[PDB]
Design a protein around this nucleic acid. Structure first.
Lengths: 105, 422, 95, 160, 78, 99, 78, 95
DNA sequence: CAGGATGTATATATCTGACACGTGCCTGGAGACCGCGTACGTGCGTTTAAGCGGTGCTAGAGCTGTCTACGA
DNA sequence: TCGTAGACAGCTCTAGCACCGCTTAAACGCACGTACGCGCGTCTCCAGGCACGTGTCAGATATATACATCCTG
DNA sequence: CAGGATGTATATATCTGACACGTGCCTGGAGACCGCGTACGTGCGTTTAAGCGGTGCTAGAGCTGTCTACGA
DNA sequence: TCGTAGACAGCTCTAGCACCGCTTAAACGCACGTACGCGCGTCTCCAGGCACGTGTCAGATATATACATCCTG
């Protein structure tokens, strides 16, 4: 029996239990620790993905570009933090121009 | 004209299973506790052991051409056309201001403005508390508001919650949407190209924090029939494929020899066959062939499947050490009549024979089956032939929660003088 | 050819559930692995240290979530905190 | 309607009134022993938006400055209104004579109008809302706030 | 009151501590919102760090280790 | 009077345009020079993956995108529309790259 | 030349990428000094990170892991 | 009374060599322990990770200094890099 | 253009307590495997409450021994 | 399977909380005006390290000089 | 006050290659223990070289098996 | 003492470096002028995962519309 089958999250939570041990996070690491983490990881992987999925549909047709992916992460105020010290490649700016920059008459 | 050589399903090609020829007198059944039977404010007019015919909706005074079944929503559209409304007007399910909620009334023509611009309604869609009308021009009407998996109110994502006033829905898929597919809060249109679209929840692809209600696709390839039950979906690709992706708690998609659906799989058709129609409920699913023999799967706890004990299949679910649980394998049985079309509900299967003969194979404790006073469940089908609709040739079958929308017209010699056979 | 155990497959799989058609890029389908990288990482150390500054030589869920809450942003945290709870309850309820 | 839907409808009505600058159902009249007073020409219900305390907006001493020059000339009446707009003293100095009516509203501790902060995309707006059902002909009044010993010594009507 | 607590001859004090030549009118309570903000950001993760070891009395080192994680590791106590 | 666009509209579109693209806006061959240049002062006689190479651009390309971005406020906030030298610097201190 | 490499229609390009309404005269090569600076800060720790594993060919992940340590962890390659 | 293994003594001792009279404060004599804390820490992880991103399951001097160089600022690094070198050569030359 | 009113740099008597070193102890480390104008500064009077300690009450952090369910 | 970390009831006692009158530093209020804003791995042996106790010199303290510095007639 | 010159949003035919799914394989995971003025923008002509690929040479990263000195 | 990670000579082959003429996009130069700056743990079983191969639909591409938008007589 696959533990990910058991717990019900996709991203292999045996690789989480096995990345953890030899990743040297600590001496010991309980069964659930990989699990709850796996599900922490996937509720992210998922919450992330679909922001692109909705956005990438919006601009492009089907497949996400990088500058789609980050075109999402900029816009979700929650993630915007999460990925606020990062630099997702090929992104470019979710555009903005200052109020004292656009036309005036 | 790149989009011309692309469309594989037509409006005309789905005309067989919706509208009819002659203006049929409607009928009702079961306990319509939410004023849903359409028998006025009368408390005595709610109860019904067996069939009837409409007083406020005569056959020639209303001209009832096209109906719409549902739990707490029973509507209609004439050839005129019209917008008859008989349902629990709480989630905006009536589509108007109205008790008068149990008095069948035509919604005004000013509400929908394609009837003021050369077009008519192809079919009438009714979810658990939803409404929408696939207009002929291309645009799709709307009404009501779906009830969520958690259990709350939403209409068009976060820009609308309760849609009591009936309004058109904006552009979703360039190719004109052919048919509809009701059941649950899970409305599931079909484009001209064969792009299985999908609004509401469809919970049983997956997400959170709303923003999904208002869309849109996707899945499938080029489906001709989109045939939705409550928490069970049905699809069939123009390349003769048979799919069903939903809440397979009790084998409601028929794609599991064991007792939820991730990506559509369903049917193993041996030799050859052509499915004429199909429809389903919460734990009761059915598709019928072009020859006549049926093909249904569902649970066997509420007597949703009509196969009373003796007629029990080999590939059927059980308990650990108890009674029969479910039937995830298809089959039309041997002791069964020439079924022409079908209609379904929670577990109250209102069928329709070739001679217009009713046969209610389901839970008739709330008299949805319509065979007089009897609290037990219909373990197989039940040949109905009472004073009103024994001779009267049946047309459009229906079912909701605790109901079964009958209807048709009184038959002539061509009925008795031809089908005197017995 | 040493086996590069990449989240590629797993990263792909979770796409399907959220969105069936389609759909990614090569540059991005790396970008995903570096969202899985920084999290798996950042999470493990507010997990690791937690154990040290609460004196227990074994990383339980006890920590993993505590970090998870302490590490994820506001509404998202409670969400994945919920999704863990779920994958926590299902892991226990297996055969 | 929900509590959020009623607040959004109440905010959209207040934003339209602040934008148009409409001061309907109100006229100037000479009150006995108060100079100019604002009186109602139509019945105002409880919670209805009366009029914005309109003037020149600025920072903390950015209103308490023309104060140190308006003390140098006593004739110009005290028309400054200070307030804490999101941690920072943000006001509306209505010392200059204009056609706006909010600056001419008299003082009363148990009046028929309450002063509240109404934010519109970052810019603070002092608004006067009816505390109770205001009768036609009666004077519009609101609590000025300055209950200090120096101010109450110079004009004793602030107490009542 | 709490935010009134950070009072003028202290904002100022704290501001003359970086050579602030003159504090403007609005500027003052802005510091309260900020000092609120900063307070807010911090106490929260910190209490949350007390939580993950079940202390009803919040530790100093909890303040500190959280004062680290945030990004301005303070030295002295710890 | 031939066809013309009043001073600003053009580069305003430059914003529209350059704010749209995911196109690394400074020539590759050129950077490989600058890339290999600062190599020398580090470690004489070296090689680097063309892959790696890109990133180095990527980041500092990106870094610059926001540090020019942040720099926009630096003169926006100085009664200015046009970004001069000091403006660039001011931002460095509020980052603490220098001060 | 190297610093001449970061040429006007690219600084600009890079600067219009943050809505720069107009680049001033001096401002341009200032970017070269900065882009030098940034280049400088980085390549160094990175090469130093190649050193601590003895690679004469500098890895991309070396660039990356160093691009992390500095403080602007880039995503994609790694 | 659990034994608080504080750098106090050691922190004091190294003061004497640099300066004999005197001389510290209580607040500062904690501040010292949090200069020893952040370094011992920051150093160990550019040591730890080094091992992972150069695949060796044991932290040698090989790493410790590499970090030390990679972690200390410019002139200081070469200095302590020298002082290590020294304490490296003396450790080897013992009986 | 300059001498007198503020208050800061500076000097030295003097008591206080924390820095610093001695000691029994015990466990961890060792060893072998320009100009209109108003906002804010400066200074003195009125007034709020911070800082002070004196101290009793006890919450609850901290430590220990035991049983046993967790995870390598 | 099984070594053992973790659960946990049990218990010593540090340390946080409420108390509460009082000298007074400090927050507050206000008038005058001018500079200034802003628009133009494991068993064993044992001494290194820490908690504990104790004496006094570094430094806080304060009256008291002299001093550099800022400003109007 | 407004219609015509720029160039951006939009539509659709069409070839290309990377996304995506099948397969033998092997190891890791699973299980039991306001105003003077100049600086910079806009646009067209001259001119530098980036980008292109075609490709041969081989540095050096990467992997393997063996001996042995390092450190728990 | 001793299990074994690390040193290290040995070896396959990816991938980085130099080459080098050419269409042309782009950097460069310059004139005109107006908006804008600036001053006023371990043995075992085995299938999950990855490298490899292969077919095609998402998307880059480009001629070609129609479109929103900016500006002087």
């Amino acid at each position: 029996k696959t533990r990910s089958s058991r717990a019900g999250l996709q991203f292999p939570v045996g690789r989480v239990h096995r990345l953890l041990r030899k990743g040297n996070y600590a001496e010991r690491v309980g069964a659930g620790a990989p699990v709850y983490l796996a599900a922490v990881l996937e509720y992210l992987t998922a919450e992330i993905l679909e922001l692109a999925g909705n956005a990438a549909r919006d601009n492009k047709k089907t497949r996400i570009i990088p500058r789609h992916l980050q075109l999402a992460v900029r816009n979700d105020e929650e993630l915007n933090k999460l990925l606020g010290r990062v630099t997702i490649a090929q992104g470019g700016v979710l555009p903005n121009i200052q109020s004292v920059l656009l036309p005036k008459k | 004209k790149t989009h011309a050589s692309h469309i594989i399903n037509a409006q005309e090609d789905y005309k067989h299973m919706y509208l009819s020829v002659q203006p049929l007198d409607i009928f009702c059944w079961g306990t319509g506790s939410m004023c849903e039977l359409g028998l006025g404010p009368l408390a005595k007019n709610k109860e019904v052991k067996r069939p009837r015919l409409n007083p406020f909706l005569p056959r020639d005074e209303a001209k009832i051409i096209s109906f719409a079944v549902g739990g707490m929503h029973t509507l209609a559209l004439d050839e005129e056309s019209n917008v008859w409304s008989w349902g629990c007007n709480d989630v905006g399910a009536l589509g108007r201001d109205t008790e008068l909620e149990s008095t069948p009334a035509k919604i005004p023509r000013e509400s929908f403005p394609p009837l003021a611009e050369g077009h008519k309604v192809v079919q009438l869609a009714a979810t658990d508390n939803m409404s929408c009308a696939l207009f002929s021009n291309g645009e799709v009407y709307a009404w009501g508001t779906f009830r969520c998996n958690e259990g709350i109110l939403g209409f068009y994502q976060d820009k609308i919650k309760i849609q009591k006033t009936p309004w058109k829905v904006p552009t979703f898929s360039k190719y004109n949407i052919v048919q509809l597919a009701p059941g649950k809060d899970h409305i599931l249109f079909l484009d001209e190209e064969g792009m299985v679209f999908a609004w509401g929840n469809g919970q049983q692809m997956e997400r959170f924090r709303l923003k999904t209600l208002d869309p849109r696709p996707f899945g499938l390839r080029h489906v001709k029939y989109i045939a939705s039950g409550e928490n069970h979906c049905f699809a069939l690709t123009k390349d003769n494929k048979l799919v069903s992706w939903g809440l397979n708690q009790f084998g409601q998609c028929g794609v599991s020899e064991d007792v939820l659906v991730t990506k559509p799989k369903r049917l193993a058709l041996p030799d050859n066959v052509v499915i004429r129609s199909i429809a389903a409920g919460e734990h009761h699913s059915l598709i019928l062939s072009q020859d006549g023999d049926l093909y249904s799967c569902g649970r066997l706890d509420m007597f949703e499947v009509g196969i009373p004990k003796d007629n029990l299949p080999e590939y059927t679910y059980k308990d650990v050490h108890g009674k029969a649980r479910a039937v995830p394998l298809p089959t039309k049985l041997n002791n069964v009549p020439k079924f022409k079309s079908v209609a379904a509900g929670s577990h109250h299967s209102v069928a329709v024979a070739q001679n217009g003969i009713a046969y209610s194979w389901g839970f008739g404790e709330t008299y949805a089956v319509g065979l007089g006073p009897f609290e037990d469940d219909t373990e197989v089908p039940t040949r109905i032939k009472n004073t009103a609709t024994q001779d009267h040739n049946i047309i459009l079958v229906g079912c909701g929660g605790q109901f079964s929308v009958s209807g048709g017209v009184k038959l002539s010699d061509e009925d008795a003088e031809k089908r005197a056979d017995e | 050819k040493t086996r590069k155990e990449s989240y590629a497959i797993y990263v792909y799989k979770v796409l399907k559930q959220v969105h069936p058609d389609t759909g990614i890029s090569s540059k991005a389908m790396s970008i995903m692995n570096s969202f899985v990288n920084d999290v798996f990482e950042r999470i493990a150390g507010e997990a690791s240290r937690l154990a040290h500054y609460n004196k227990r030589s074994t990383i339980t869920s006890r920590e993993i979530q505590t970090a998870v809450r302490l590490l994820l942003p506001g509404e998202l945290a409670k969400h994945a905190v919920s999704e863990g709870t779920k994958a926590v309850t299902k892991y226990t309820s297996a055969k | 309607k929900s509590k959020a839907e009623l607040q959004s409808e109440e905010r959209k009505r207040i934003d339209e009134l602040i934008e148009s600058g409409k001061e309907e159902g109100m006229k100037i009249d000479l009150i006995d022993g108060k100079g100019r007073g604002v009186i109602a020409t139509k019945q105002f219900s409880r919670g209805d938006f009366v009029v914005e305390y309109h003037g020149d907006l600025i920072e903390i001493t950015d209103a308490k400055k023309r104060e140190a020059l308006y003390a140098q000339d006593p004739s110009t009446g005290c028309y400054m209104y200070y307030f804490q707009y999101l941690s920072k003293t943000y006001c509306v100095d209505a010392t200059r004579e204009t056609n706006r009516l909010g600056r001419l509203i008299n003082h009363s501790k148990c009046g028929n109008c309450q002063t509240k902060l109404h934010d519109i995309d970052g810019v603070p707006h002092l608004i006067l809302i009816a505390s109770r059902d205001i009768a036609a002909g009666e004077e519009l009044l609101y609590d000025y706030g300055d209950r200090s010993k120096a101010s109450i010594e110079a004009f004793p009507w602030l107490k009542h | 009151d709490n935010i009134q607590g950070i009072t003028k001859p202290a904002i100022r004090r704290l501001a003359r501590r970086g050579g602030v030549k003159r504090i403007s009118g609005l500027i003052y309570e802005e510091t309260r919102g900020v000092l609120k903000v900063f307070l807010e950001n911090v106490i929260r993760d910190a209490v949350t760090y007390t939580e993950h070891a079940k202390r009803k009395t919040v530790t100093a080192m909890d303040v500190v280790y959280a004062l680290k994680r945030q990004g301005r590791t303070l030295y002295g106590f710890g | 009077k031939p066809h013309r666009y009043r001073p600003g509209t053009v580069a305003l579109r430059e914003i529209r345009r350059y704010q749209k693209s995911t196109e690394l806006l400074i020539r590759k061959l050129p950077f490989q020079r600058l890339v290999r240049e600062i190599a020398q002062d580090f470690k004489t006689d070296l090689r680097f993956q063309s892959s790696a190479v890109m990133a180095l651009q990527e980041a500092s390309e990106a870094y610059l995108v926001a540090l020019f971005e942040d720099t926009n406020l630096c003169a926006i906030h100085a009664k200015r529309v046009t970004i001069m030298p000091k403006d660039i610097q001011l931002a460095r201190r509020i980052r603490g790259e220098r001060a």
